[PDB]
Design a protein around this ligand. Structure first.
Ligand code: ADP
Ligand code: ADP
Ligand code: ZN
Ligand code: ZN
Lengths: 67, 67
């Protein structure tokens, strides 16, 4: 129910990439959840190239108001 | 994973009861989810007494970082 989705949009917007601190985070939809990763796509691909997993991670959010 | 819980604490704190606009919302833990209701307990009980379901509702949040 759309008020939940609006919260998820707010939460996404206020959390820039943990590495570059400017770009928005990468994300994906998996089944009924939104997965927000810690970094943008550029910084994540770079983290593999440099050998750092320090900022790897994510959090999952239910995209519906009722579980 | 505790960073998720910290977000849920922020989201809860910034959303006063939709009716009285001052008190924090009622909530409950159901299985792996946090249910945040639209109103505080006082306003919800009052809504039954006055016959208004306008502000009845809730949103559910996964309490873990990985779904
Ligand atoms: N953009 C990113 N920023 C930080 N960590 C990421 C990013 N993309 C993938 N990861 C990490 O890489 C791993 C793989 O994630 P993912 O592909 O979503 O796994 P799954 O197989 O469960 O769908 C996870 O630890 C995830 O946190
Ligand atoms: N404090 C409250 N504020 C607004 N609506 C509420 C409140 N408490 C209960 N409700 C509403 O009353 C109904 C019953 O909720 P609940 O007891 O959590 O149902 P369930 O049987 O699924 O566990 C729902 O529509 C819920 O949104
Ligand atoms: Zn970045
Ligand atoms: Zn109230």
């Amino acid at each position: 129910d759309d008020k939940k989705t609006n919260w998820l949009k707010r939460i996404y917007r206020v959390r820039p990439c943990v590495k570059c601190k400017v770009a928005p985070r990468n994300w994906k939809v998996k089944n009924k959840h939104l997965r927000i990763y810690n970094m943008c796509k550029t910084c994540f691909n770079n983290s593999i190239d440099i050998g750092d997993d320090t900022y790897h991670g994510h959090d999952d959010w239910l995209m519906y108001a009722d579980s």
